[PDB]
Design a protein around this ligand. Structure first.
Ligand code: CA
Ligand code: MG
Ligand code: MG
Length: 448
């Protein structure tokens, strides 16, 4: 193995940037705001029935608003809509997409109503599809309001029985209004798998199985599809991992200057450190990516594209892919936990949102705030005001985005269930971002 430099024509989250985060993160510029613990409520309408027909107060975690094509929050027949994962706090494998809704003008968490699950259990068996019949959980995605006024959902088909296989999936959700304050899910159609990896550009579950599966410490991902449009084309941007031809995992990746950045002396010392320490194996296996595919207008796969950015050597897990245009530029964001990173000074409690900017959709992504740090949340997982899945929601006017997240870990408290965190504001200006210090919003608030 010899030193080399191959970018594979894509951008990279680099070690030289990540190593600076520990000394940079303890600043009001990046810190997720301290939240008012005493006033946090559960989502009162987050109730579901189980197989025995008993009503349960649900945990409600990763959530996403129904968006216009440009990323702004849609208004659907006078409502804002939020899709969210939810289930029984007592069953960590009970995960379904629910549809919540609130009158556009209303603001309080109490004004969020629950239209119930998007899918019936029987729905997955209806279409002629190679994957849906194997689904065991419904994981996160995105939602777009089409120009024809249709509710178009993207989510992740997770299959515990197929070694944690994850498939980008879509459906149209048919809605009606039986009265003035109710939205009803009538059913779904055009329900189908879109993409489950190819092997060369993005890792497949089969690659995961063949290398030896869970015992290996590899973490296979293919999830959180986020819909965008760019000048007549439609895309999904999603969490994945590289395939064999765009810089795969492997001991050889540790010799690729592209993943280190900085200059030769840093690359030599950091490489040596990696090879001699207990991060070697995890760094080798680390090949996270924010992938992109183009879709046809019927939401089928049109083209598998090279990733926008990767985290080779740094982590296998860059989550909650998010991307939108602001000021003529494309901003790209991802959530990532320090516990899965291989960076000195980043620890078990550290959770981040990282951000990058490009002049074009597939162009070079450069880090925001020099290192790529946007948000830092380090509260212990037991903290009631622990937040996760931070998501930047672009706005119609101004330079602020709204950050949504879920609050309180799943199943951690008898009375305090995973719920909508109070939303907050981040300023975006060129390659700089800053948390807006003197404002907090309602729990689950999407727009200002
Ligand atoms: Ca990997
Ligand atoms: Mg504060
Ligand atoms: Mg396939």
């Amino acid at each position: 193995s010899k030193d080399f430099n191959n970018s594979y024509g894509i951008s990279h989250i680099t070690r030289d940037n990540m190593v600076k985060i520990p000394q940079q993160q303890n600043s009001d510029q990046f810190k997720v705001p301290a939240f008012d613990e005493s006033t946090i409520k559960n989502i009162a309408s987050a109730k579901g029935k189980n197989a025995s027909g008993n009503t349960i107060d649900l945990d409600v975690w990763d959530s996403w608003p129904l968006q216009n094509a440009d990323g702004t929050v849609a208004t659907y027949h006078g409502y804002q809509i939020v899709f969210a994962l939810a289930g029984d706090p007592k069953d960590s494998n009970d995960t379904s997409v629910y549809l919540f809704y609130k009158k556009a003008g209303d603001k309080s968490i109490d004004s969020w109503k629950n239209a119930g699950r998007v899918f019936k259990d029987s729905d997955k068996f209806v279409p002629n599809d190679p994957h849906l019949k194997n689904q065991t959980q419904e994981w996160s995605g995105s939602g777009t309001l089409t120009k024809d006024g249709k509710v178009r959902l993207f989510y992740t088909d997770y299959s515990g029985k197929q070694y944690g296989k994850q498939t980008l999936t879509t459906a149209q959700v048919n809605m009606s209004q039986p009265n003035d304050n109710t939205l009803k899910v009538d059913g779904v159609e055009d329900y189908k798998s879109i993409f489950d990896g190819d092997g060369k550009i993005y890792q497949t579950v089969q690659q995961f199985i063949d290398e030896g599966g869970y015992d290996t410490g590899d973490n296979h991902t293919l999830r959180a599809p986020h819909y965008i449009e760019d000048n007549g084309h439609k895309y999904l941007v999603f969490e994945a991992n590289t395939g064999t031809e765009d810089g795969y995992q492997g001991e050889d990746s540790l010799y690729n200057r592209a993943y280190y950045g900085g200059n030769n002396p840093f690359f030599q010392s950091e490489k040596k450190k990696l090879l001699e320490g207990s991060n070697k194996e995890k760094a080798s296996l680390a090949n996270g990516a924010l992938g992109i595919i183009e879709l046809n207008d019927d939401y089928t796969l049109k083209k598998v594209m090279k990733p926008l950015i990767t985290s080779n050597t740094v982590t296998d897990e860059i989550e909650r892919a998010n991307i939108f245009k602001k000021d003529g530029k494309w901003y790209l964001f991802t959530d990532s936990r320090g516990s899965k990173m291989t960076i000195d000074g980043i620890g078990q409690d550290d959770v981040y949102m990282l951000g990058y900017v490009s002049n074009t959709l597939t162009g070079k992504y450069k880090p925001l705030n020099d290192t790529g740090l946007v948000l830092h949340m380090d509260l212990d997982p037991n903290d009631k005001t622990f937040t996760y899945s931070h998501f930047a929601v672009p706005q119609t006017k101004g330079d602020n985005v709204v950050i949504t997240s879920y609050m309180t870990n799943r199943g951690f408290y008898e009375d305090n269930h995973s719920t909508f965190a109070p939303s907050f504001l981040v300023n975006i200006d060129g390659s700089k971002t800053s948390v807006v210090k003197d404002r907090v919003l309602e729990q689950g608030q999407l727009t200002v």
